[PDB]
């Protein structure tokens with residue numbers, strides 16, 4: 001699993017469950033092409049987005065649908081979504097975890113890149 | 116001043132100075148139209164992006180060019196930029212402060228919205 | 231003003247108003263001695279805690295009473311308080327802004343240190 | 346495992362390895378009594394701090410030695426340590442994960458409390 005996403009909720013103190021997300025890869029014409037998508041599990045995780053063969057170097061965007069998550073909880077949010085845009089770089093063996101911590105008017109995101 | 120941006124550096128413990136950013140507004144055709152741009156001052160603030168008249172209801176995107184900021188400090192960071200996407204002025208005019216706190220592999224953002 | 235505190239609320243998207251906090255300074259006997267206290271204003275800021283003369287070198291602790299803040303908003307939060315412990319003025323006088331961003335189960339803090 | 350700690354590094358984009366931490370429980374005389382301690386693993390985790398029988402309701406403090414972590418990396422940090430102070434409450438079956446994301450001048454912490 002070269003790419004996985006972990007989403008946490010700072011209001012409930014829990015994983016953020018059933019959060020939809022879309023992953024895009026930047027194409028040659030500078031447009032965002034759909035690459036992978038899914039919904040977070042009961043543990044706030046989304047595994048199986050891609051494979052080592054498919055996940056080549058390039059610029060990727062992970063769009064997390066935070067607005068729909070907060071609306072389903074009956075809480076007024078600020079953001080339309082949270083976006084994480086990064087370049088995947090082959091240095092040596094790398095596994096990427098994108099983590100996000102959500103609040104109605106704020107979000108934080110970090111990357112955990114390991115061998 | 117209805118839209119202000121404050122950027123802080125979590126490595127140095129300082130305002131993030133000379134950070135470029137571009138603001139876009141979603142048009143009727145679902146494309147991102149350029150709206151305003153500028154760079155942060157010595158206090159890490161960017162003022163005067165727009166006016167109460169021009170800042171109508173809409174979906175806005177603030178793209179903070181964090182990769183250029185870190186590269187100039189000798190750090191190869193994870194993200195291409197930090198993006199803040201939100202609906203503005205849909206319940207009438209509000210004043211928005213978008214704040215961002217930057218690290219090489221992480222960022223946080225929050226909004227302060229006043230009437 | 232050599233020591234200022236700014237507190238924001240990530241649920242409401244507003245300054246965190248009327249937040250109490252207590253500042254302590256470590257004494258020679260390794261105990262926390264009371265140093266200053268106050269509460270945040272309508273802008274979420276607390277100014278005038280100390281003076282350049284009184285704010286000598288030392289280890290300081292800023293204890294922000296976040297549990298009382300959330301309880302008054304109808305939220306039973308996770309933390310008792312948010313604590314910020316740091317050495318100040320060990321390379322000469324500096325001006326410190328301690329910022330905190332609050333959610334019911336999370337908090338973030340940063341410092342802006344200027345000469 | 347009723348209590349575990351996850352520490353991440355926002356400068357390196359990695360787990361924070363070999364971070365020492367101390368857990369204390371508030372005693373009747375309002376003093377902090379040592380309860381458990383250890384150092385984070387290669388995954389930034391610290392497991393086996395306590396057991397379900399020992400981890401009773403009370404006020405706990407997790408002190409993360411961030412200063413020594415940054416000094417070992419040759420980076421000047423702001424904080425002496427990061428403190429997380431909370432009440433453990435029996436509602437139903439609960440497992441607590443305290444997570445922290447570290448930068449030299451900032452830290453963020455959240456709680457993930459699950460069944």
Ligand SMILES: O=C(O)c1ccc2nc(-c3cc(Cl)cc(Cl)c3)oc2c1
Nearest residue numbers: 214216223224225329331338339340
């Ligand atoms: O000193 C001021 O005036 C000032 C203004 C805006 C501010 N936003 C923060 C802040 C933002 C994020 Cl996203 C996370 C954290 Cl920990 C802190 O600190 C501020 C300080």
Ligand SMILES: O=C(O)c1ccc2nc(-c3cc(Cl)cc(Cl)c3)oc2c1
Nearest residue numbers: 099101108109110444446453454455
């Ligand atoms: O319990 C786990 O396994 C687990 C994994 C990844 C995690 N990422 C965080 C985290 C992320 C941000 Cl952006 C801000 C903060 Cl305060 C915390 O906490 C985690 C916990």
